[PDB]
Amino acid sequence: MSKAQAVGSNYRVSLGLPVGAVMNSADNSGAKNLYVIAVKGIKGRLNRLPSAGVGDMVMATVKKGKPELRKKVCTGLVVRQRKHWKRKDGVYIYFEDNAGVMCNPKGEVKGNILGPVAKECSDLWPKVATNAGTIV
Amino acid sequence: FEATPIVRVAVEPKHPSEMPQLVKGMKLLNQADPCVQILIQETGEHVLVTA
Amino acid sequence: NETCSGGNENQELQDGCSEAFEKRTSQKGESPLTDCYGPFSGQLIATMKEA
Amino acid sequence: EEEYLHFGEKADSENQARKYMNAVRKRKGLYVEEKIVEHAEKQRTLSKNK
Amino acid sequence: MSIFTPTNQIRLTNVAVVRMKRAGKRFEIACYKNKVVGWRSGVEKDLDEVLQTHSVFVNVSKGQVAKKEDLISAFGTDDQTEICKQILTKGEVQVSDKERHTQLEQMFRDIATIVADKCVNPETKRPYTVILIERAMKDIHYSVKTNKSTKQQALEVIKQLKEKMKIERAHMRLRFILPVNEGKKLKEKLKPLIKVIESEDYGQQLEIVCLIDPGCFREIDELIKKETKGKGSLEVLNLKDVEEGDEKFE
Amino acid sequence: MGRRPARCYRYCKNKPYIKSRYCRGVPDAKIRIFDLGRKKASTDEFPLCVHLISLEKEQLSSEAIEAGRISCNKYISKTGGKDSFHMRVRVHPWHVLRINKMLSCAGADRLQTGMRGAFGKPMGTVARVNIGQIIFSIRTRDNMLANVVEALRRSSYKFPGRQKIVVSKKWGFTAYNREAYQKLKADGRLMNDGANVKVITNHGTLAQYAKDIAAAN
RNA sequence: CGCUCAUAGCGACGCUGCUUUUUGAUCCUUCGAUGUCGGCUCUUCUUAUCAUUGUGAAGCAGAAUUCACAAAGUGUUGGAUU
RNA sequence: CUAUGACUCUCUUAAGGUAGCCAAAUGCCUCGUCAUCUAAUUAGUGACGCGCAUGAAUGGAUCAAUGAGAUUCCCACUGUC
RNA sequence: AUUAGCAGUUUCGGGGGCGUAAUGCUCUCAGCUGAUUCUCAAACUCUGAA
Numbered sequence: 001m002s003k004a005q006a007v008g009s010n011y012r013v014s015l016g017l018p019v020g021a022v023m024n025s026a027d028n029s030g031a032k033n034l035y036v037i038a039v040k041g042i043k044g045r046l047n048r049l050p051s052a053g054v055g056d057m058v059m060a061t062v063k064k065g066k067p068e069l070r071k072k073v074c075t076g077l078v079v080r081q082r083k084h085w086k087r088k089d090g091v092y093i094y095f096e097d098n099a100g101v102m103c104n105p106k107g108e109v110k111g112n113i114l115g116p117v118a119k120e121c122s123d124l125w126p127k128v129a130t131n132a133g134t135i136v
Numbered sequence: 137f138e139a140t141p142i143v144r145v146a147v148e149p150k151h152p153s154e155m156p157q158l159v160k161g162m163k164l165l166n167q168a169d170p171c172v173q174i175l176i177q178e179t180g181e182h183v184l185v186t187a
Numbered sequence: 188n189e190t191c192s193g194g195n196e197n198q199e200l201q202d203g204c205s206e207a208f209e210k211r212t213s214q215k216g217e218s219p220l221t222d223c224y225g226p227f228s229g230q231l232i233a234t235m236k237e238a
Numbered sequence: 239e240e241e242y243l244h245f246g247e248k249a250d251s252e253n254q255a256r257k258y259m260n261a262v263r264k265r266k267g268l269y270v271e272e273k274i275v276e277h278a279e280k281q282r283t284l285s286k287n288k
Numbered sequence: 289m290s291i292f293t294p295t296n297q298i299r300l301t302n303v304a305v306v307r308m309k310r311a312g313k314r315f316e317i318a319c320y321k322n323k324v325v326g327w328r329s330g331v332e333k334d335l336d337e338v339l340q341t342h343s344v345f346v347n348v349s350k351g352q353v354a355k356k357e358d359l360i361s362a363f364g365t366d367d368q369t370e371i372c373k374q375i376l377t378k379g380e381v382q383v384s385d386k387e388r389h390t391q392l393e394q395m396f397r398d399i400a401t402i403v404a405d406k407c408v409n410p411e412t413k414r415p416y417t418v419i420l421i422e423r424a425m426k427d428i429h430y431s432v433k434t435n436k437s438t439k440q441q442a443l444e445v446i447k448q449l450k451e452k453m454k455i456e457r458a459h460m461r462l463r464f465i466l467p468v469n470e471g472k473k474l475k476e477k478l479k480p481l482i483k484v485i486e487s488e489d490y491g492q493q494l495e496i497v498c499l500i501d502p503g504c505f506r507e508i509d510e511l512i513k514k515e516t517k518g519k520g521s522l523e524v525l526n527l528k529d530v531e532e533g534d535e536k537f538e
Numbered sequence: 539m540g541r542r543p544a545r546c547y548r549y550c551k552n553k554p555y556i557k558s559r560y561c562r563g564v565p566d567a568k569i570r571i572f573d574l575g576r577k578k579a580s581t582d583e584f585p586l587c588v589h590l591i592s593l594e595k596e597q598l599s600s601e602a603i604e605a606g607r608i609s610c611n612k613y614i615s616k617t618g619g620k621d622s623f624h625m626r627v628r629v630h631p632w633h634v635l636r637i638n639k640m641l642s643c644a645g646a647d648r649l650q651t652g653m654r655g656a657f658g659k660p661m662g663t664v665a666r667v668n669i670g671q672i673i674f675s676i677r678t679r680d681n682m683l684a685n686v687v688e689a690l691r692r693s694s695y696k697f698p699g700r701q702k703i704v705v706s707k708k709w710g711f712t713a714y715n716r717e718a719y720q721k722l723k724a725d726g727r728l729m730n731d732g733a734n735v736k737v738i739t740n741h742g743t744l745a746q747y748a749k750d751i752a753a754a755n
Numbered sequence: 756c757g758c759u760c761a762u763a764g765c766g767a768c769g770c771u772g773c774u775u776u777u778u779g780a781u782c783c784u785u786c787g788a789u790g791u792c793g794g795c796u797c798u799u800c801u802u803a804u805c806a807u808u809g810u811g812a813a814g815c816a817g818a819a820u821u822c823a824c825a826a827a828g829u830g831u832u833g834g835a836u837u
Numbered sequence: 838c839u840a841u842g843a844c845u846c847u848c849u850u851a852a853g854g855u856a857g858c859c860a861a862a863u864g865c866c867u868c869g870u871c872a873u874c875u876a877a878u879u880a881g882u883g884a885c886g887c888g889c890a891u892g893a894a895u896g897g898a899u900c901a902a903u904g905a906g907a908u909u910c911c912c913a914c915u916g917u918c
Numbered sequence: 919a920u921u922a923g924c925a926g927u928u929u930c931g932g933g934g935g936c937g938u939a940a941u942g943c944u945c946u947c948a949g950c951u952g953a954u955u956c957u958c959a960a961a962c963u964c965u966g967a968a
Contacts, residue, residue: 005799018833019833035876037834037876037877038833038876042832042833043832044832044833045832045868045918046832047795047832047833048833048918049833050832050833050834059876060876061876071875071876072876073876073877074876092807133758135776142437145262146263146265147417148261148410148414148420149410150423151392151427152408152424152427155410155411156410156411162252164277168245173267176267177412178267178268179265179267179268180264180266180267180412180413180414181267181411181412182410182414183265190264191287197493197494199338199494200465200468200494200503200522201465201524202463202465202496202524203288203464203496204486204496204498208496209486210487219397221493223423223494223496227277227463227524228496229463229524230276230278230525232273232277233273233276234273236273237276253433256365261419264416264417265414266412266413266414267538268414270415271398271415271532272407272529272531273416273532274526274527274531276527277525277527278449278509280525280839281527281528282396282526282838282839289786289788289789289791290789290790290791291788291790291791292791293790293791294791294792295843296791299645299646299647299811300643300644300646300778300863302644303646303720304645305646305865305866305889305891306865307865307866314889318854318886321866331702336659337638340643341639341641341651342659343651349865351646353650353651380864380889381865381866382864382889383869384866385867388866388867388869388870392870402839406845417840429871429872431870431872431884432869432870433870433871433885433886434864434870434872435870435886435887436841436887437838437839437840437841439838439839439840440839440840440841441840442839443826443840447893480865504839507838507839515829525894529839543770543771544771545768545770545771548770548771552960553960554958554959554960555960556919556958556959556960557919557959558919558961559961560960560961570920570921571959572921572922572956573923573956574922575923578923578924579797581925588785589951599768599769599770599810602768602769602770604769605769606769607769608768608769609768609769611961623952625957626921626922626957627956627957628921628956628957629956629957630920630921630956632920632958633832633959640778640779640780642778642779642780643778643779644777644940645777645778645779646778646779647779648780652779652780652781653780653781653790665957674943676955685962691961695769695770696768696769696770697769698770698771704945711955712955724922729953730924731923731924731925731953731955732922732924732925732953732954733922733923733924733954733955734922734923734924734953734954734955735954735955736953736954767887834876834877835876835877835878835880835881836868836877836878836879836880837868837880
């Protein structure tokens with residue numbers, strides 16, 4: 001799932017961390033944390049984490065949030081990777097700290113996206129682009 | 137009026153507090169479609185009447 | 188502890204409910220005494236179904 | 239269970255057309271009462287010589 | 289090897305033990321978890337088909353065979369045919385997982401089938417709703433134990449059904465035979481306690497008072513009315529619990 | 539078989555063990571019924587005979603035999619009327635197969651009930667044959683023959699080894715051909731006993747047909 | 756069995772096989788000692804091909820499956836529990 | 838027997854597991870059942886407990902303080918990966 | 919050890935139309951007995967292997 005990239009996949013993979021990394025929910029829904037289970041499309045090989053997306057969809061969970069949203073897996077969307085990258089451009093976007101949002105399995109983000117969102121992510125997921133006034 | 141007379145099913149709901157919920161819904165179902173067994177009990181209120 | 192069935196007779200034992208008691212008390216003409224004897228009422232009810 | 243010692247067959251005495259009763263008969267505005275048969279005092283005194 | 293010796297323990301455990309504790313001595317048989325069960329509930333296949341070993345041990349695990357003499361002492365028989373059969377029929381089996389599951393299911397069915405008498409009808413009846421009883425059993429989080437009998441479990445579950453909440457149910461029709469003038473008094477007394485219908489008043493004849501009493505505390509109830517009355521009398525019953533009357537909230 | 543795949547009971551070996559006053563756990567054979575069709579039908583009314591015969595000495599199982607019979611059972615409406623049908627097998631599984639069981643089936647090593655005292659409980663009942671002994675026979679009228687051979691054909695698959703089908707020149711279950719088995723009726727010196735025949739007794743009997751006449755009725 | 760229809764797809768009762776990836780039977784080699792089990796690591800290998808490619812079937816309209824062949828060239832994962 | 842077995846009756850080898858406690862470091866069946874803890878738990882912990890084969894100075898039950906003690910769970914400075 | 923029909927029967931077993939149930943007629947079953955056939959037996963053999 002979902003899947004819709006992009007055109008392209010907005011080029012190479014970069015992560016803040018793979019499996020077992022907290023990033024904030026950045027969402028009006030009362031998920032307060034997002035912890036990764038795994039990432040979609042990772043086919044992977046012998047001993048290698050299923051590694052965080054640059055703006056791609058993930059199997060996640062609400063570890064600390066609303067108890068209703070707590071437990072039960074959730075497809076999400078990575079929004080900003082603390083750990084850095086170069087783009088086809090020659091810039092190195094880098095962030096304060098990791099972040100994403102909990103989302104629908106057609107990609108759609110629920111409420112409104114908080115804070116700054118890398119443009120690649122927006123490009124990937126049109127709903128994301130729609131539901132924010134910050135796309136930097 | 138019914139195209140084919142009498143199509144029914146004696147279903148039952150799930151979880152204890154939502155037993156009258158079904159009944160309540162069937163009051164709204166009446167509004168929607170002309171036939172449902174909510175008014176006048178012949179086969180009990182947990183039964184559909186359709187064509 | 189009955190030698191035989193009845194209704195006409197009694198030993199202050201068993202049951203046998205009828206329409207006579209609720210309508211207008213004792214039964215005369217059609218029988219000497221009202222039915223308060225023979226197999227008890229519940230049993231009677233059961234047995235009809237069975238046969 | 240006394241009558242099931244004769245053994246009604248699984249196809250012909252339990253048809254798919256003849257299962258309209260386990261989950262197709264909970265219908266009562268008027269009537270659908272089925273009582274448990276036989277009554278004779280207690281569970282020890284019901285049948286002793288019988 | 290060196291110092292490093294492939295032991296891998298005595299002989300593999302991989303079959304149903306059937307532990308029979310006769311003459312204070314354990315005798316056991318190589319069978320299978322399912323096969324024994326099958327045998328003991330009707331499916332009488334062959335004696336050495338249900339038994340992977342048609343002989344008797346004293347410790348199936350440790351690989352020890354019993355003395356003929358012991359058998360003779362215990363069972364009064366030498367031939368392994370009879371002894372084996374006995375062991376199969378009346379010794380402690382090890383069920384599988386499948387068998388365990390089946391047992392559990394059976395228990396579940398018989399704490400809704402026994403509770404079908406005291407069933408959970410919705411707002412109106414719709415009198416049976418046995419499916420809904422079954423459903424309700426695990427919605428409360430109940431230990432459907434296969435150790436205890438069904439009846440006991442039924443008793444337990446109704447108490448919980450009270451704190452579901454949807455009230456305890458257990459009503460029948462007690463037809464009390466009451467002679468002389470104290471019958472009337474008794475009737476008067478018990479009218480607030482339980483329901484009174486199909487009544488009659490007689491000084492020279494018995495009174496057929498039909499009440500709607502508790503069924504799962506019925507005997508006790510019966511005991512404490514006669515005493516109140518003073519004189520000895522007869523109070524007939526149905527079976528245990530019946531769904532002739534109302535079982536919606538009652 | 540059930541405990542075995544019939545590959546260890548393919549070939550004749552060891553002397554005959556049977557359902558005896560020495561064995562006793564011996565199971566009942568898989569068929570105790572050996573005829574199929576009109577057994578009332580006469581020796582004379584049916585004059586057509588086909589056999590089934592092995593070419594190699596092999597131990598046919600009772601189950602196998604049963605299976606074989608219930609081809610020819612079902613090839614009967616396909617044939618055309620059970621009325622025009624006889625069968626008799628003519629090989630009864632008298633002999634019994636031994637099975638020392640391997641107590642280990644999911645694990646556990648004997649060397650104690652291993653191969654010591656390792657003598658079979660009888661399980662398996664079976665019939666021996668040779669290089670031409672009959673294993674099915676069919677009496678019938680001369681209508682069905684391509685039908686019966688097809689039934690046999692089915693039967694052939696249900697049996698181990700290379701079989702063979704021969705049409706006897708007899709009238710089916712009789713020691714006379716047809717050239718002979720008209721002369722008996724024609725000359726009228728036959729004597730009948732239902733499904734069998736008898737024949738009058740001159741070189742059959744002599745000391746008891748010396749001063750006798752009741753022996754020409 | 757499969758609406759129909761034995762073999763599209765299965766296939767009862769029955770028979771013939773392969774296999775040495777189960778375990779037993781065995782005790783030929785080693786008790787003047789081959790370092791026992793597992794997991795990490797890593798190559799190579801076999802096909803009884805899961806994907807892949809090229810194909811043939813179907814009860815294959817499509818998507819989705821199911822069955823067969825050629826074919827081992829390349830791929831065949833991250834955890835929780837033990 | 839609605840029944841966990843209070844209670845009665847009997848048999849041996851005298852007594853017949855009381856109060857407690859438990860799939861415990863004690864429970865084979867066994868990954869016991871129900872519950873929680875987890876995205877997922879043969880792990881832990883609460884409960885249940887006709888307990889293979891628990892149990893009262895063979896000492897039973899609990900528990901502050903302590904422990905290079907055994908187990909788990911969470912925060913815990915992220916080259917173990 | 920063990921299969922198959924056939925024959926004489928059975929008021930000596932049982933049930934049908936007739937007849938006293940019938941075992942009498944006309945059908946099937948049960949048992950006995952007589953004539954034949956199937957297959958056969960390491961711990962069987964009338965017979966017999968250099």
